[PDB]
């Protein structure tokens, strides 16, 4: 990606100067964006889960692996050995492609993207974005599951400090309130 | 969760435990350790806990990390073992999957008079 090379040059220079980092790779580096569109309807409407996967596939270019619960609950109708939820973890070129596509196409189409930040870092440098609806994503046709759901896009970084993660986010211009 | 070297050490510990449990004929144990740059090999004896023979890319002075130089390393170590009059060996990796460079070293040693 041309923006990937732009990321290289720009992130290196500003970050290096911003904290006098003694090495170019001391600057934070983003690793992997997990997407987890999971639903318990597979306990009853198994069909739905299948469609779920395809949409997830259609969004990232990686086929989603379906995850299984590690316990069993009667109230939730849960039982061990069943597949409830798919997770995809993008890396390399595809992860940066999805990140740019999200921030530039999907996110500003959000009904009311006022944003949320500073109050999202887990204290170790991660970040989770809770999407409310799937239809807003461009890689989705109107025909879909009878139920509509959101997403749990998350982020990782090489650093362990949440403040430096915020600094990388600002350098990348991820558009949130004051952050 | 870890770094590559720690996982390789863990797998190597598994292999060493198995070999020390089942090696009944007290064969010499040929542990080869592959790095990002080079790959070395040493023939220990778990009964005496010493090294009988050794060979390495540093010893052979090659820009290693290639399947080509693995054949040279295997030929040298097999020649040294033959000079030592030991031919019944057990071959274990440093914890890496037996393939590529590791497979070439083992086959070069086998084709030069070794019995394993």
């Amino acid at each position: 990606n041309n923006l990937k090379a732009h990321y290289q040059k720009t992130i290196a220079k500003e970050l290096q100067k911003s904290f006098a980092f003694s090495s170019i790779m001391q600057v934070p580096r983003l690793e992997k964006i997990v997407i987890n569109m999971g639903v318990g309807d597979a306990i009853r409407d198994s069909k739905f889960l299948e469609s779920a996967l395809n949409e997830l596939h259609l969004i990232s270019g990686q086929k989603p692996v379906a995850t299984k619960a590690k316990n069993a609950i009667s109230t939730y109708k849960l039982r061990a050995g069943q597949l409830i939820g798919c997770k995809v973890t993008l890396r390399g070129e595809r992860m940066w492609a999805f990140l740019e596509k999200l921030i530039y196409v999907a996110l500003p189409r959000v009904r009311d993207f006022r944003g949320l930040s500073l109050k999202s870092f887990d204290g170790r440098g991660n970040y989770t974005i809770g999407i409310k609806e799937q239809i807003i994503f461009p890689e989705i046709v109107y025909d879909d599951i009878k139920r509509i759901r959101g997403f749990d896009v998350t982020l990782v970084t090489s650093t362990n400090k949440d403040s430096e993660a915020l600094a990388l986010l600002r350098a990348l211009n991820l558009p949130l309130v004051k952050g | 969760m870890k770094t590559r070297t720690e996982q390789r050490r863990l797998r190597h510990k598994r292999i060493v435990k198995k070999i020390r449990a089942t090696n009944h004929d007290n064969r010499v144990v040929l542990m080869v350790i592959k790095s990002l740059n080079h790959i070395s090999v040493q023939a220990w004896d778990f009964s005496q806990n010493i090294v009988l023979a050794s060979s390495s890319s540093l010893a052979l002075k090659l820009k290693n990390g290639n399947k080509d130089n693995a054949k040279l390393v295997g030929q040298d170590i097999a020649d040294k073992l033959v000079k030592l009059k030991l031919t019944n060996v057990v071959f274990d990796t440093g914890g890496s999957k037996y393939h590529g460079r590791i497979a070439a070293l083992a086959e070069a040693a086998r084709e030069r008079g070794l019995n394993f």
Partner: protein, 46 residues
């Protein structure tokens, strides 16, 4: 991994007001699909 039926092809995206033809890999029509609200067309971002 590879050998997929859903090919990630570099599709260009146009937008209103500001053209901003962003080229991104996706499994959609291979042409300049126009988006009505892009990043630059948002009161929050600018």
């Amino acid at each position: 991994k590879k050998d997929f039926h859903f090919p990630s092809q570099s599709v260009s995206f146009k937008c209103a007001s500001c053209s901003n033809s962003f080229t991104i890999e996706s499994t959609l029509k291979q042409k300049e699909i126009t988006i009505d609200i892009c990043g630059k067309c948002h009161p929050f971002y600018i």
